């Protein structure tokens, strides 16, 4: 009479699944169980998250000190998990779903904020955004490996970029900003706004 595990998965991927008629409940247990099996398959295919063991333990202690699993407790767990993610400078991280494999196993789905594209926007002295790929080759270097597509965005990597390029003295204003990628669900665009001196 309890809850045995909290899994925490990171989800981007894609899904199918179709449907059918002739709903003999005797049978339609077929579909409603194929969905459970597919969910288990997804939970194993999925990538584990950045949550460390101490915070897993704290969430599980919250879950044990309250025998029954209530939605308010899930809200508090979400608050704690997002607190950890943001404390480590994972600004874009967010919980999106609380699934179940059975009433005893809770599945928390997070979007960590993976980087899908790198964007460098140049602005002329007066702030009017202009084009120009003469500085792009040098600004591509002096960028941490961790800002490239294939990593989870962290504000610390943003600060490292903001200082490496800062050291060249080529811009009067440097900003690194994550933005929600409209072409990808949960993906993040790292845009780097550079404003020139004079």
């Amino acid at each position, epitope marked *: *009479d309890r809850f045995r595990c909290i899994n925490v998965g990171l989800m981007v991927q894609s899904k199918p*699944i179709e*449907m*059918d*008629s*002739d*709903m*003999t*409940d005797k049978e*339609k*247990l077929e579909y*409603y169980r194929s*969905l*459970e099996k597919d969910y288990k398959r997804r939970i194993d295919r999925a990538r584990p998250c950045l949550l460390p063991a101490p915070v897993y333990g704290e969430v599980m202690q919250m879950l044990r000190d309250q025998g*029954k*699993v*209530s*939605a308010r407790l*899930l*809200q508090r767990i*979400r608050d704690r998990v997002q607190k950890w993610y943001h404390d480590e400078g994972y600004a874009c991280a*967010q*919980v*999106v*779903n*609380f*699934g*179940n494999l*059975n*009433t005893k196993e809770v599945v928390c789905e997070v979007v960590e904020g993976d980087i899908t594209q790198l964007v460098i926007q140049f602005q002329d002295k007066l702030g009017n955004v202009v084009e120009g790929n003469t500085q792009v080759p040098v600004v591509r270097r002096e960028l941490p490996k961790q800002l490239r597509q294939g990593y989870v965005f962290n504000i610390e990597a943003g600060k490292k970029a903001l200082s490496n390029i800062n050291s060249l003295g080529l811009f009067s204003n440097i900003e690194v900003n994550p933005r929600p990628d409209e072409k990808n669900e949960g993906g993040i665009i790292v845009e780097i706004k550079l404003k020139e001196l004079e």
Partner: antibody
Amino acid sequence: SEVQLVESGGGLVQPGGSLRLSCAASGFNFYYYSIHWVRQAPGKGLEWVASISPYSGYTYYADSVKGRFTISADTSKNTAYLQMNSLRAEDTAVYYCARSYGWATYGLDYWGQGTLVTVSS
Amino acid sequence: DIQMTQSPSSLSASVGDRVTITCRASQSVSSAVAWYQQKPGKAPKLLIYSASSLYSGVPSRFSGSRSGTDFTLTISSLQPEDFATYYCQQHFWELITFGQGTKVEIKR
């Protein structure tokens, strides 16, 4: 193939009274499903009131009803029940009984016919 | 508390239009959203069980779609038999929450 729900009980009661509603489960095996009670006020929206967990006997109630209603189920006759106590006028509604497979992750597919509970002096 | 905001309260449409009803969860906590159609004097019927999955024996004109905390029910060519009230519903574990409803009426 599509054998369905009948809500029984329900009627007129006075403020402070009590009532018990039955819900007869014909054609499905309500271990794999969860039984929920939802009430619709006169000419108003839908409001979830109570739920029972599949397999295990975990009981969940809405805060508007907590402390006066108790959900239950008899596995033998394929039945679920809803006990209403310290009844108030705001409980006047139609009371539906509907199943959802699994726990808290799928849709209320098969609903009942309904039953009216009028709470008036 | 978790709260769905369903909009519009009512819309008027003609037979053949593509109608879109949206409802928004107050927090990103659950993708377990369902769509129901209820005609007056009767019991609600299930249209959409997962956030976008078409339920059995429902006509193909009904569609579901999700964008963050935004859920959308969509009818391609409104038939006469689709004039009713529509409700969206979410499963935050025990918290079963319904939208306020959308009444689909005849344009005139």
